[PDB]
């Protein structure tokens, strides 16, 4: 015998970068939602896991191409939504401005062209201090990003509900889900399993604490490219995650003001009631117990005293716990009783004093910025803290600081890998065609 | 007993939804609809008999007409974006009158080749486009305060070339041939074709134009005849001719708006101006409404009456159609319906007036400037269907409530079906 | 016979107009795409296609039309994210560069906010600013025509070789008759999956960086007996040309309007030194001598060359691109102006820079090229002449359009479809 034969079915794969496409759980279908809009491939009978028994397989998360495609999307997906909307260019005029109290929530006024290009009409609009900037000190303020970027405003039509999104691979590929309940970011997965589409990740753009993330299975996990490196980022997961909520008691309502012909933009009308600073409440015992448990986990990879020291500062994008809520973003100090002390080895709650920002520069790309219209009615939300972007800095000092926001996406696509199936097995055998 | 066999080429089908594509006779030059894109040829003698198979379809829940409006609306978007926008023209615009009631010899300040020098200019506008800012000396373009407005390039033209839709290779398009079709339900005579043989994208809101005359018999269509909000569609047999004309000799003039951007405007009235005529053969029209009424009596057993349109705005109340490179808006009620019957060579006329600025699709944030065509233009055409809304006796008012309903008058008789030629049956054979 | 038989894999080919796509090998961005494309596609994959004849012509070709409607799209697709430079179009008041071809203008401009404006000064070349009518007040040349778009400061627009490759299921029949003029039976034909590679350099009177001719001077034209059709000469022993802008120039970031700036010329360091391009006259003179004999036998009468002047300075001058900067040279100061009966040195050409251009012979699309800081010494090969057939025959350099440049390189290719189905009788029948 000893002749070659072919098999048109065989388990074989290779690591291959490939384009992916969307799938969604069909949560409602109004088609102005930034992420879905007209929406993607409709749903599926999602449970599809496969045993894939005792296949020894290894991979590293920090090099996977799937996360990169999820930064090819979003940033390109936002552009597909911001393009039709208005430009705030005509609003970059010297602002006469003052205060509104009977906190830095100012009241500004300016020239503004009416329905005709010729006539002008004074209009008053409020602004938080993080939008205006001093001209060099009183009065004559100006919009922050107008000196480098073409400011545009998100249309009120669209919303930012972080709807779940499922990633599928084109037929002929597969995703090798890893189930080992202490997968330490990189290395062997002794209990791999396949699945045609991934879990329903939520596009939550956190920067210091990962909101609404998936909970780790029955053990605290710590991932990093190189724990021994002094500068590289580190990601921590949690079990029995902790609560965090935020509200703005100010019952604002939006006014619409003219800017030239056709174009209009929306701004704060009046402060119903009185200015009460935005709040966020966190259970003190839960945070202390939670961080205490992580303290032991962080200790057992350095074997020395670990010290929490608050963020570095210098701006508000990096040194603050920025997150989206409803459509009016927050940028929050996250340090008062949240850090600045460590452990030796009441039923109240912690408080975070923090503020609002209209013009947000996002993705750290110079030349583009977006304006979020104010959201009427008092706004409230609740979320789960499910990950910390701690950065390492005798002892060891850990500074809570987030690098590029791709870290968030690597915080839930950790247990996935893309494979290309080529079922064309070759083998010897006894036979020959007769 | 017996075993399974799979027969390829089984004719089973099921309803489906599909992204259809275009085809046409061939025509060059920047025609808006066909463009230099649509597939040519398809001379189609392939009307397969499909002998006596029962099938049912309804034009109302049909998901092909809505696909026709999912584009065309997008088709113009492809052609508006490159062209010059007309926002800078929104300036305090001072008018007195035009003579050598509805045309203004109006003047305004616009910037010359460079943005440092103004230049006094005069440009005509029909009364509809402007709105008095106020007893009146200042004016402005109507849609300035609600929407930005762009200008159609004269290079493109709206002359409707017919377009053929084609099922993707693998589907099939059915067709009903019972000429007395109900409008919904089973059809006793069915056929199939890859591509339909004719549709025209002409836009109309009160009366159809250039449409396919009914198949030898008058037809009546509706979602629900016994209802007061759903639009009735009448499809005429022995169509009645119409002709509208602009007898003026207007001359085009190009004026500038800042650097680069420029547009065309009506320069001067040449000759004696007359109101744009619209003539219809009244001798045919009289008994024409008599015949459709008799069909209406066939469903309601009583006399009927016709009134003017529902009034209000100039979008629901008026015959609106393209003569090509120009938009018409006619009263079409004052001297034209008014009444009914019991049980002389002349032609009836209509008051009509032109509008440069239009609000097509009647949606916020969209508008366009129609570049006037120089000289006289005439367009004889056939009326083939009235659109009637329902208000002892029965009352009707012409004028459809939505322009999408127009397409139902030509794409009613098609339904997309996914031919899936895989079937299972028993047999006596087994693999041996 | 008595029975047909299907023979799969049959060689049969027919003409077909169909799309073509990427090729590249070996950063921020480049105007000719190339930032992400198919790699390498090595060269030696040809089939010599022994001794089968094929007759074709280069003029009714598909690749050139397939291409000119692509490059015109590649550039247009690149300039969308960057500033439309209209706000600069204001009344200029200009003095001379006190360091006649350069002027030093002043204008008001909108600063980082609406109402506060400042006086700014920037340098310009007289070739593209027109007095507004001594006057001494000017404006940008292209303001009454159309918008002008700044070339993005970060991108680069020097040529990169791109191979055209036909989709799978087709072939490209490369002609190998080295003495072929582009019309007739190519008795030595070959087929290639992906073309050899062509360079996107634009020109109007010289074919720069182009593929060299082999053992011949070949003259190509659809009609040598026509006074408006272009003549293309393909050159034996390509000559070398050097071009330079020896001014040590610096760029200044003038701010106009909100958002982004546009880079402009600052101080002319040192003293003005006009640009020049150098040619070895003996090389050129006897290079012209070679072509003087080739076209003579196609007309049987004596010939002359002439200036080709009398135009809008786009086609009449030797317009080309190099080193991120544009050039427009007289190229007939004494360069051609000669007729033929039958020393180590050089001849030099005076040239003009232009800051804004209108390329692809169209209107509605003009662009601004920011200056290149420092000196440049553009050097290139020369391989062809876009001569024009104007007792004796008169010749004048200059093409009729810009597709002629591409038509010089893609003549030895024709896209073709392969039909692997062929029926033929055979003695057998199914068992």
């Amino acid at each position, epitope marked *: 015998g000893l002749w070659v034969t072919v098999y048109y079915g065989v388990p074989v794969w290779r690591e291959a970068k490939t384009t992916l496409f969307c799938a969604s759980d069909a949560k409602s279908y109004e088609v102005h939602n930034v992420w879905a809009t007209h929406a993607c491939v409709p749903t599926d009978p999602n449970p599809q896991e496969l045993v894939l028994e005792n296949v020894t397989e290894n991979f590293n998360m920090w090099k996977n191409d799937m996360v990169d495609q999820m930064h090819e999307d979003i940033i390109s997906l936002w552009d597909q939504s911001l393009k039709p909307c208005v430009k705030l260019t005509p609003l970059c005029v010297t602002l006469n401005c003052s205060d509104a109290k009977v906190e830095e929530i100012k009241n500004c006024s300016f020239n503004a062209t009416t329905e005709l290009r010729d006539k002008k009409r004074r209009e008053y609009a409020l602004f938080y201090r993080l939008d205006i900037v001093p001209l060099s000190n009183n009065s004559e303020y100006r919009l922050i990003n107008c000196n480098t970027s073409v400011i545009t405003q998100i249309c009120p039509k669209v919303t930012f509900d972080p709807i779940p999104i499922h990633y599928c691979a084109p037929a002929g590929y597969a995703i090798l889900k890893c189930n080992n309940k202490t997968f330490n970011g990189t290395g062997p997965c002794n209990n791999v399993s396949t699945v045609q589409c991934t879990h329903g990740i939520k596009p939550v753009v956190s920067t210091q604490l990962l909101l609404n993330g998936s909970l780790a299975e029955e053990e605290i996990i710590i991932r990093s490219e190189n724990l021994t490196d002094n500068v590289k980022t580190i990601i921590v997961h949690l079990n029995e995650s902790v609560e965090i909520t935020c509200t703005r008691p100010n019952n604002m309502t939006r006014k619409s003001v003219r800017i030239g012909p056709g174009q209009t933009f929306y701004a704060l009308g009046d402060i119903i009631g009185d200015i009460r600073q935005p709040h966020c409440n966190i259970s003190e015992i839960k945070w202390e117990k939670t961080l205490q448990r992580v303290s032991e986990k962080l200790r057992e990879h350095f074997n020395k005293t670990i010290i929490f020291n608050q963020s570095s500062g210098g701006d508000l994008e990096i040194t603050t716990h920025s997150f989206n809520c409803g459509g009016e973003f927050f940028y929050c100090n996250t340090s008062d009783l949240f850090f600045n002390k460590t452990f030796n080895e009441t039923n109240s709650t912690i408080t975070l004093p923090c503020r609002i920002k209209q013009i947000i520069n996002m993705w750290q790309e110079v030349g583009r910025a977006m304006y979020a219209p104010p959201i009427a009615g008092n706004i409230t939300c609740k979320s789960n803290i499910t990950g910390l972007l701690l950065t390492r800095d005798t002892k060891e000092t850990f500074r809570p600081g987030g690098g590029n926001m791709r870290d968030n996406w690597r915080s839930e696509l950790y247990k996935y890998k893309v494979v290309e199936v080529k079922p064309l097995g070759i083998a010897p055998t006894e036979c020959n065609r007769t | 007993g017996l075993w399974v066999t799979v027969y390829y080429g089984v004719p089973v089908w099921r309803e489906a939804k599909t992204t259809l594509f275009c085809a046409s006779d061939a025509k060059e030059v920047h025609n808006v609809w066909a463009t230099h894109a649509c597939v040519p040829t398809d001379p189609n003698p392939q009307e397969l008999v499909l002998e006596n198979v029962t099938e049912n379809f309804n034009m109302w829940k049909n998901d092909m007409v809505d696909q026709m409006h999912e584009d065309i609306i997008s088709l113009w978007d492809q052609s508006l974006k490159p062209c010059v926008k007309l926002t800078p023209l929104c*300036v305090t615009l001072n008018c007195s009158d035009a003579k050598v009631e509805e045309i203004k010899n109006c003047s305004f300040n616009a910037t010359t080749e460079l943005r440092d020098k103004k230049r006094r200019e005069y440009a005509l506008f029909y009364r509809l486009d402007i709105v008095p800012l106020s007893n009146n000396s200042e004016y402005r373009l109507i849609n300035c305060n609600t929407s930005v407005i762009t200008q159609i390039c004269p290079k493109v033209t709206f002359d409707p070339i017919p377009i053929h839709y084609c099922a993707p290779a693998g589907y099939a398009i059915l067709k009903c041939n019972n000429k007395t079709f109900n409008g919904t339900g089973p059809c006793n005579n069915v056929s199939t074709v890859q591509c339909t043989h004719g549709i025209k994208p002409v836009v109309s809101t009160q009366l159809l134009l250039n449409g396919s005359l009914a198949e030898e018999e008058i037809i009546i269509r509706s979602e629900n005849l016994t209802d007061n909000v759903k639009t009735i569609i009448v499809h005429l047999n022995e169509s009645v001719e119409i002709t509208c004309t602009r007898p003026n000799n207007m001359t085009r003039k190009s004026v500038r708006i800042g650097p680069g951007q420029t547009f065309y405007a009506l320069g001067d009235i040449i000759g004696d101006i007359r109101q744009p005529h619209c003539n219809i053969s009244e001798i045919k029209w009289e008994k024409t409404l008599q015949r459709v009424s008799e069909k209406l009596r066939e469903h309601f057993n009583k006399t009927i009456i016709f009134n003017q349109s529902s009034g209000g705005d100039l979008e629901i109340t008026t015959h609106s159609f393209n003569c090509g490179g120009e938009f018409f808006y006619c009263n079409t009620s004052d001297l034209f319906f008014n009444k009914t019957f019991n049980e002389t060579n002349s032609t009836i006329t209509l008051p009509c007036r032109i509008k440069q600025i239009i609000n097509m699709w009647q949606e916020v944030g969209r508008a366009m400037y129609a570049p006037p065509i120089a000289g006289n233009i005439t367009c004889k055409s056939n009326i083939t269907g009235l659109l009637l809304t329902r208000d002892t006796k029965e009352t009707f008012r012409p004028g459809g409530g939505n322009m999408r309903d127009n397409w139902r008058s030509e794409l009613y008789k098609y339904k997309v079906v996914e031919v899936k030629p895989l079937g299972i049956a028993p047999t006596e054979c087994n693999r041996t | 016979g008595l029975w047909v038989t299907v023979y799969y894999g049959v060689p049969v080919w027919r003409e077909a107009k169909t799309t073509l796509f990427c090729a590249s090998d070996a950063e921020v961005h480049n105007v000719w795409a190339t930032h992400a494309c198919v790699p390498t596609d090595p060269n030696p994959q040809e089939l010599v296609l022994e001794n089968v004849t094929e007759n074709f012509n280069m003029w009714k070709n598909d690749m050139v039309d397939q291409m000119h409607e692509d490059i015109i799209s590649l550039w247009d697709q690149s300039l969308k994210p960057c500033v439309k430079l209209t706000p600069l179009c204001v009344t200029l008041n200009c003095s001379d560069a006190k360091v006649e071809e350069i002027k030093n203008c002043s204008f008001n401009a909108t600063t980082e906010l609406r109402d506060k404006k400042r006086r700014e000064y920037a340098l310009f070349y007289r070739l593209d600013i027109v007095p507004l009518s001594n006057n001494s007040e000017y404006r940008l040349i292209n303001c009454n025509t159309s918008v002008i778009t700044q070339i993005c400061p970060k991108v680069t627009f020097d040529p990169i070789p791109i191979h055209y490759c036909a989709p799978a299921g087709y072939a490209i029949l490369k002609c190998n008759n080295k003495t072929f003029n582009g019309t007739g039976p190519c008795n030595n034909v070959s087929t290639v999956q992906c073309t050899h590679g062509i360079k996107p350099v634009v020109s109007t009177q010289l074919l720069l960086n182009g593929s060299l001719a082999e053992e011949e001077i070949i003259i190509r034209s659809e009609n040598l007996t026509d006074n408006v059709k272009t003549i293309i000469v393909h050159l034996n022993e390509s000559v070398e040309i050097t071009c330079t802008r020896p001014n040590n120039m610096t760029r200044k970031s003038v701010r106009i309007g909100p958002g982004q700036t546009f880079y402009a010329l600052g101080d002319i360091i040192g003293d003005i030194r006009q640009p020049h391009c150098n040619i070895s006259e003996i090389k050129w003179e006897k290079t012209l001598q070679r072509v003087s004999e080739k076209l003579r036998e196609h007309f049987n009468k004596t010939i002359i060359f002439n200036q080709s002047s009398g135009g809008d300075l786009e086609i009449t001058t030797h317009s080309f691109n190099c080193g991120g900067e544009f050039f427009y040279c007289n190229t007939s100061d004494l360069f051609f102006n000669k007729t033929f009966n039958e020393t180590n040195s050089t001849i030099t050409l005076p040239c003009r820079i232009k800051q804004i251009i209108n390329m692809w012979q169209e209107v509605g699309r003009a662009m601004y090229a920011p200056p290149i800081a420092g000196n440049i010494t553009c050097k290139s090969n020369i391989t062809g002449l876009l001569l024009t057939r104007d007792t004796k025959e008169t010749f004048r350099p200059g093409g009729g359009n810009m597709r002629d440049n591409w038509r010089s390189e893609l003549y030895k290719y024709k896209v073709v479809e392969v039909k692997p189905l062929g029926i033929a009788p055979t003695e057998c029948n199914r068992t």
Partner: antibody
Amino acid sequence: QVQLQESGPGMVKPSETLTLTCAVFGGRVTSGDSFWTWIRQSPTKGLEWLAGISGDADNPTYNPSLKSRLTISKDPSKNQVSLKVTSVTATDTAVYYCAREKQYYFDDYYSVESGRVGMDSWGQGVAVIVSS
Amino acid sequence: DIVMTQTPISLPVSLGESATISCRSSRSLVDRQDGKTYLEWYFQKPGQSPQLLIYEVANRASGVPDRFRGSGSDTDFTLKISRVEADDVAIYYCMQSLDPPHTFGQGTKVE
């Protein structure tokens, strides 16, 4: 800015018609941003405004008190503006000026501001005496 | 036609002092017109032609110093010199520029 200069006879006979000229340096007479005008400095009454014309080609307007006897025009061919005084009286003896009332018009897409800066630049002034 | 009154007609002063000049309108002035208060001031040394000082009530001419400043109500208009000096000796003219013909006042002679 515009350097400017008046020129014309300074000695005039009574009751005759006088023509005065002013040549523009560094600009155009017809450009719309300017509004040329002439002013006289009398000894008793002082300064007074006579006429001005620019922009809309034929756009003259004269003081009602002296509306009867004035005429003014311009030509880019020589780039000057000339004023004609018909039937001069002895009281008209005074220094006459030519002045450029400056306008402007900037269109930055969104807003089209427009106005004037008064009479920016004045000529040297030409003295005319009515005597014989 | 519309006449401007002026006070003072003359004012002697030494170096370092501040001076105030006023002129009043007759026909309303700043009558809307979608414009603004079109009032202007001019000064003239002996022998030389008049030159611009202020326009639109409170805007200084090209490159002139802060030695002076103007203000005015709907119909009342005033001019003040912050600190007089030697070269300030001249005749100051109140000029309105609302409607044609423009009308000056009969000077304000300050020494």
